[PDB]
Amino acid sequence: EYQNIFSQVQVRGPADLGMTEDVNLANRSGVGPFSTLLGWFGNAQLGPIYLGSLGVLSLFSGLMWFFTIGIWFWYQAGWNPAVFLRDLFFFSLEPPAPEYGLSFAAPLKEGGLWLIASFFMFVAVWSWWGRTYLRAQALGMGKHTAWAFLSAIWLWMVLGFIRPILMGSWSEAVPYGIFSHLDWTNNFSLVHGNLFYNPFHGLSIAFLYGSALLFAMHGATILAVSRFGGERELEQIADRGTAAERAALFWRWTMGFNATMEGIHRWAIWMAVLVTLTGGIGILLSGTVVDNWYVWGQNHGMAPL
């Protein structure tokens, strides 16, 4: 049996420059190389990428954010390349201490650089959101990607900006560092009682597990009906074929209800968005309204005592 997991023979020809409605092509670059390695799985063509005003804004801000964290990491190793190599995962760019509160008077070396890098990150992420919206608009498409990204941005903003302001301290944002931000996560859980007893934390976990579930389900279904041209979904929405029917009937005979080629993607987008939506709500309530979630669960019929 051929499982359709990897292409067994590849083809290529002229590069596709893409559709040309309401798009300024002065900003679109030239097509890049073809990758035979990427071609065994999906498309082999790289580029062209669109480079606009927001593209340059986002590139500048993100590059400076990454560079600032890197320069702090180099300082923190004593400028030693070997120490930088060995402690790359242990370095950290840590926010101001609690006694500064929300003030921008923290010296350069316990959190002025954190504030600078955070400003760069803010500009980069919001520029990228605007760029997503405008790239969708230029082609006459819907703005669904912008709103899903907005959900992700909501969680990010709560973690780094809104919750520190509500608690009145920059010390409660997330440090820039691999193991350091993992320890921030663990210590956030320890300080507020179990986050396991945060109901919105549980909902967020439910929707992350549901994302993995639904997307295994959908990938498997589409690969199983790809023998009828099932992977061509816009056309199956346009003109229903036997792949769509067989998929619907499989799920109807399995669990009693099914979806449409169109509607399974509404399920998918909402399942993925609810993760960060409920996560942001839970983190915002965490500490501002409840500071011991296990006791809250005891009070709300969740924990035995």
Binding site: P199, T260, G263, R266, W270, V290
Partner: peptide
């Protein structure tokens, strides 16, 4: 409290969203 208000508001919103999603999926067949 606000934890409870938020959780109940989410239950209502989830019921509405499930209804909407199934309604969109009743367009073929």
């Amino acid at each position: 409290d606000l934890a409870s208000l938020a959780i109940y508001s989410f239950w209502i919103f989830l019921a509405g969203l499930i209804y909407y999603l199934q309604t969109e999926n009743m367009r073929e067949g």
